[PDB]
Symmetry: D2
Subunit: 293 residues, 4 copies
């Protein structure tokens, strides 16, 4: 099983992608044992990025590692098809696309066509980015098999039956979970790991949970999972997307700049009060020697 990082997108104060901070972050992640980097996902504000910025993220992370999965979806097919085709000159793992978002109650025929269209033009493996809440629709294991070109899938959902059903109807298919709270459970049940936002700021923890569960040390893996759960919950107090920046700076040293409004940054006060609820968690992670003081 793997741990993939939907890598944050650091923005400058003038709202420009910080290519240089993004690189320092990708290095720390690969350094600390992350398997691949999932680019332009929700955690990096993919839908907030222009086709040229979605490509920036690729080009800046490709200076660091070629263990990349490249998300290209939007509400303009010609834009996505271009991004799919330009990735040909990048030796990477694959490209990804979430279902066309916003517009509710799209037909199963129109969604299957969107994905098949991207397979017809892709120069790399195609991963499905199934996120029913964010997109408004669910490409479940049945429609995934109907489309029939998905090398893998990130299933962002709380129902683990839904996720396992991909591996049931699509046996050859890689099946990752988007939930950070199921890292220990996904590792132990025979799926191919997790795509973990929380690994942006605690890659140490996400990897160690994976290892403990791999070692059939489940009682221990749950000890550490539940701790990571408490951080996922603290970041939720002030908007997790905006708190993901604060928590990477607190746990990993370097800062990642700013998010893109309306994903507003935390102010100095929200930052203090958030640090105040993970101090205790950071300490026990140090006492367990999972983190360096």
């Amino acid at each position: 099983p793997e741990i993939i990082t939907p890598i944050i997108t650091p923005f400058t104060k003038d709202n420009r992608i910080d290519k240089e901070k993004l690189k320092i972050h990708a290095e720390n992640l690969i350094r600390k044992g992350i398997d691949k980097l999932f680019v332009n996902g929700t955690t990096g504000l993919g839908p907030s990025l222009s086709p040229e910025e979605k490509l920036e993220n690729l080009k800046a992370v490709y200076d660091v590692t070629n263990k990349i999965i490249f998300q290209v979806g939007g509400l303009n097919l010609d834009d996505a098809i271009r991004l799919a085709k330009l990735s040909k000159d990048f030796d990477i793992v694959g490209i990804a696309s979430y279902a066309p978002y916003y517009y509710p109650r799209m037909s199963e025929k129109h969604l299957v066509k969107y994905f098949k269209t991207l397979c017809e033009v892709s120069p790399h493996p195609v991963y499905l980015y199934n996120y029913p809440t964010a997109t408004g629709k669910d490409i479940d294991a049945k429609v995934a098999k109907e489309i029939g070109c998905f090398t893998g899938v990130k299933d962002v959902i709380e129902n683990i039956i839904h996720t396992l059903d991909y591996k049931r109807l699509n046996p050859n298919m890689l099946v990752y979970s988007g939930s950070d709270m199921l890292i220990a459970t996904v590792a132990s049940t025979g799926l191919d790991g997790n795509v973990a936002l929380g690994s942006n700021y605690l890659p140490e923890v996400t990897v160690t949970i994976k290892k403990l569960a791999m070692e059939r040390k489940i009682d221990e893996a749950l000890k550490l999972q539940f701790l990571h759960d408490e951080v996922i919950e603290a970041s939720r107090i002030f908007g997790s997307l905006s708190s993901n920046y604060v928590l990477t700076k607190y746990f990993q040293g370097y800062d990642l700049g700013y998010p893109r409004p309306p994903i507003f940054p935390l102010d100095d006060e929200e930052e203090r009060q958030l640090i105040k609820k993970v101090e205790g968690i950071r300490a026990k992670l140090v006492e367990l020697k999972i983190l360096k003081e």
Copy 2:
């Protein structure tokens, strides 16, 4: 009360806004009694348009009428701010914005700041575009009061209490409904009108339904309202965002081009069947003399 068309965006076979076909559509809608025009809404594929293109829609429709509500929402705040500002040189009704979409569980603080921001920069009345299903968050009567700079609201929701509650807490706010199926109901219960997707292809009807109920002939209004309900339902067969293009050509007699993929046009086969579904309905409206022969 008023009938407002969330006006379709015609696209060229090259995925380009057809400014001339849109002008034709605006003229016709106004000639047939549409009060105002809602530009860059869901029906018009706003979330699929760029800021440059959202602006193109404004300038193109402003060439024919200035009864315009200019939607300017997106996931980049600076873009919405610039659009809002540039409207200053236009004599229009107001600007509007849906809540930032996609991202789940945004903080009420972040949400309120997004809207209050657009108010601080707006050179025109600010209307709330409330669409919980598509955007993934609800700006209810309470949060609207909290923001407290909305001249009006378009509430796309099944719960009509929700709609009435904007008038309960904001006694001076215009409250419209996003339902085509409540044109008669809204009029009769003292709400201010309907932003009707279906007024794109049957303005005569949407305006007549309102008329009858306001003449206190509620039984005649339901009789015609129920006829319009069948056109709404039939359009939903092949995805109503795409079927509006086929229905406007059928009923209003001019071409509106294509939608923007992943909002796929209907093919010859699907278009053929949809017209069969509404053949009879056209006949009942031509008998009742709501439509020209």
Copy 3:
């Protein structure tokens, strides 16, 4: 249009139906202008009542008025069929049944059979008691027409499109709304009125809203609707089912005893604090002379 009362079931301290208090309440209701009394509904804890107690309520209210609709549904068909048949000796409006509750995802065939079975044996008109939330399933206007024996329907839902669709596919059918917050809107849109829990403790208000909306005085009817809304909301603070007893005693004089645990009564403190939030409302109802001091 009508106002029907899903009449409370007063219980004694030893948890026995208080036939005598129930009668005093039914009289006040008919006295104050309520059209019919809906017996064994949610508001009277129907599902908490044994087949013999469901019959008690009938026999005790039939000493007062024959304007009764008699709810008989449960999870035992033989029990319901008996109650349907014993009502033959009562000259009343009809019998009612909510869809079989609790068990999720029952088949459309098994639900249509439950209702048709009760029509085959009923000696009175059969009303549908559609409450999707309480029962877990929705007998929408299409399945109502499929069953094809419903004289009417109480539609407990916030979506008024759903409710109107009964009158669209079932034109002969009586269509009442279960929502107390749509009394003014239902009266004005051409449906046959409301079944109002709130008329247990403010029948004066529910009737006056109906009358104002009947008089096409909608701006005035909304004034009074929104007030009733504030009481529906106050009763919600402490469990509305349990607060319905306190609010009938506060506004109508007589007390109705106790509810049936786990619908626990309010304690003296919750009763005081509830009275504290409707004092102001009771006053303005007096100043508008809708209520006698």
Copy 4:
């Protein structure tokens, strides 16, 4: 971990509990490795049973095994209290109760008092039966701690995080899952077992799936788990509450009679098709020698 059967209730053609057929079913389940028996659950049509009949189920199954969890829930508190008390003369595992069903938006106060009440009277360990979909309210990990007298919980829910969270906040509580499709997953992630509807007709499988995963052969466990998933799905064709009767007779070779209408039996025609759906599955289990010829 453990496998627990929510044991079916056999009914006579006269809508009467078949105490002798139930005894047969209990014996067989125990002989085939079922740890305990959950009496008067959803699968057993508890909410359709009277207190007298819920008690009949206890005495009948207690004639064969005392590994019983005695469900005693209802909408009359006194009834549940009396059932709880009468269990004192039995050497059973515990008593259980779902949250009071039907009535929406019950107060957390009223809910907690309902459960704490059953604890104050219980002569046995109290297990929480958590089933948000059917009952209409969720007793999550936090409210369980707040009540704080539950030896264990059966969590019928798709969100497996929800389930893990009982163990997070209540480190000493037994946490079971109500999913047949997570027998392998639960075992492997350190949770305490599954209350499986499907163990009624395929105990051999449900116990084997658990076995394999606990022998660390997770790939073999999924292989058999996915086979059981097809039996769950097929049963759902004609309503799985009724299909269990047909599947137990098919697989275990004895008759369990009828369910209780409105939980309608399958007819000759529906029963015929369901067996066709599971013909092949029986073959794969007989080859793999999980079933006798």
